[PDB]
Each structure stands twice: as structure tokens, then as C-alpha cells.
Amino acid sequence: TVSRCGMVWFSEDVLSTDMIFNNFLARLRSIPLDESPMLQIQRDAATIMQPYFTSNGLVTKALEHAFQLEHIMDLTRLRCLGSLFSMLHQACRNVAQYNANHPDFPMQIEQLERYIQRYLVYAILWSLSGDSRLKMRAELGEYIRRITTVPLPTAPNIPIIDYEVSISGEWSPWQAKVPQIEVETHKVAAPDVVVPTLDTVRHEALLYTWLAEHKPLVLCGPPGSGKTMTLFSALRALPDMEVVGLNFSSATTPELLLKTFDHYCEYRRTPNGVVLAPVQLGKWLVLFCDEINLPDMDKYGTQRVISFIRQMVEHGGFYRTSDQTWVKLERIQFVGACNPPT
Ligand SMILES: Nc1ncnc2c1ncn2[C@@H]1O[C@H](COP(=O)(O)OP(=O)(O)O)[C@@H](O)[C@H]1O
Incomplete structure (x- = not known):
């Protein structure tokens, strides 16, 4: 069949990093997040972060170092870049929310640029090294501090990653965000209780950022790290999206x-076509996959469930085998979890 039809080869050298950055910047400048003043805030943000997305820029050097770096998962350029773009979209939404909550005093340009610069540094930190050891995120942060001009926290030893960026455009530690709860005497070592800690608050923020954009994600970590508990805390605390835990098995099929x-869903006929939506209105059905990587590879190196999920993520829909009709996904998003593939 290889000799039965033509062939075109698209090497990774075809897509330069710079054209990707230009695509992201143009799409952010033109299309709005909500569906306009917030298009204006997008434009201001893009003007601020334009110098850092040029050739031989901060993001390019950080990305090539992360490629020199090691990660738990197979590192892909486009994965990291999509994460960075989505979380920068969330930063723009944060600025929009701050402006809405402060109608009298709009978000001024100097504070805006400081906040955007610091958030973008934090974004590289938590997106390029988001799937590595803490010491290795520390090396990445050290390199970024060496190469960047953006001001950084003056902690003698504490890494930048522990710090967060406030809506006021200042470097603030995540420690102050950690409360001090006192669990009941009869709830000690209970499965449901979640004691807030330094990692819990950061992962809560990351999950909120990556779930607001409805971008699917999978958590990775050694057994006992409580990835399921960390996700479930954010999911229950998140108001209007139901949780459907799904323990994938090695014999799982898209059936x-x-x-x-x-x-949990019903099929309704819309003028565009058949659309899948959760029965309960205003709810984003979140399908938690307990073991995303556990279903077996075929003899041809394909996991059917993961291919199915990829199909519905990229096309924004799937094909119903009952009547061979295109079905779009509405108010549906996915989260998974898995121990390291090693
Ligand atoms: N925020 C937290 N507060 C209290 N205990 C925690 C917290 N995060 C993790 N743990 C501990 O980590 C352990 C991991 O639970 P586990 O059953 O292994 O879940 P998972 O399958 O997600 O790893 C739990 O028993 C819990 O005691």
C-alpha cells in the first residue's frame, strides 16, 4: 500500500518555532476568548509579550534547554507550546476578571506589562518543566534567571517555581496561600480529607487554569502521590461541572x-447536526480516566481508547457508529491520570 499511492513527507523542520509563535500571536490578537474591550486587552498583552516570542527569544532558548532537559513523559515541542498558549489565555482572562471586579480603576499599562512578564516567566517554568523532578525544575529556573531580564524574586535559595504572581503584578510566595486547617479527631487519615500544602495550592491553580480553557490534561506521578485526590479536590470545589470517575482497565475499549x-449524556438534533450534551444543564461533564495509559497497545502500536479520545479532542466531536453521523461534543471535557510509563 505504500507503493500503491503517492507520498509527501513533513519533517519537524517544516514547522519552525517562530511560525508557531506567530500563529499563536495572530490568533490571540484576532479571535476573542469568550467567543470588544477584552479583544483590546488581548492586543495589549500580545504587544507586551511580542519581544519574548521572537527568534532567539527567551521562550525559544527555554524550550531548547527543556529539550536538552529530561521529562517523565515524552517531550514534544507542540505539547509545551500549547500548554503555554492556553495558560497565557488564562492569564488574559485573569486580567479581564480583575478589570471587571475593579470597574472604577482599569488595569493600567505599566502594571499590566509587569504582570504579563512575570506570568510569562512563571508560565515557562510551570509548562516546560511541568513534568519533571523538582531539582530539574530548579535547574530550568536557574537557567531562566541567568538568561532573562524580567525581575525575579530575591530568595537566596527558594526556587522561582514556589513563587506565584499576584493580580497586582508582584512576586508573592505560594506559602501565604496555604491555610492551616484542623481536621476532626474521627477523620484522621480519612480518604476524603485533603490537608492543604505547598504542592496542593499550586496544583489547584494549574488545574483551574487548564480546566477553565477546557483543555484536557493527564496527571503523572509515582504511586501514592495522591494524584486522584488532588484532582478530585479541584473538581468538587469547581462549581458547575460533574465528575464521572472511570477506572480504565487493560482491556478497555471505546465502547x-x-x-x-x-x-450521562443524550443525543439531540441541532441545526448544525447531532450534538452530544450532558442531560443536566449548565454542567461540564468531566470524564476522569483513572489509568489513561494502562489499556494495551495493539500489535500495530495503537491504543484504541486513546485514539478515540484524540479524535474527539482534535475534531471536537466523534462519529456515531449507529447511523454513521458526525456528533459534536458540547459541555464535555476529559481529565486522566497515570503512573509513569517506565
Ligand atoms: N493534601 C493531602 N492531605 C492529606 N493527605 C494527603 C494529601 N495529599 C496526599 N495525601 C496522602 O497521599 C496518599 C495517596 O493516596 P492514594 O490512595 O495513593 O491515591 P492515588 O491513587 O491518587 O495515589 C493518601 O493516603 C494521603 O494520605
């Missing part, structure tokens, strides 16, 4: 996903 859909 299980279809069964879960028909259990």
Missing part, C-alpha cells in the same frame, strides 16, 4: 466511553 456517554 466503555460510549456506555458512559449514553449513561
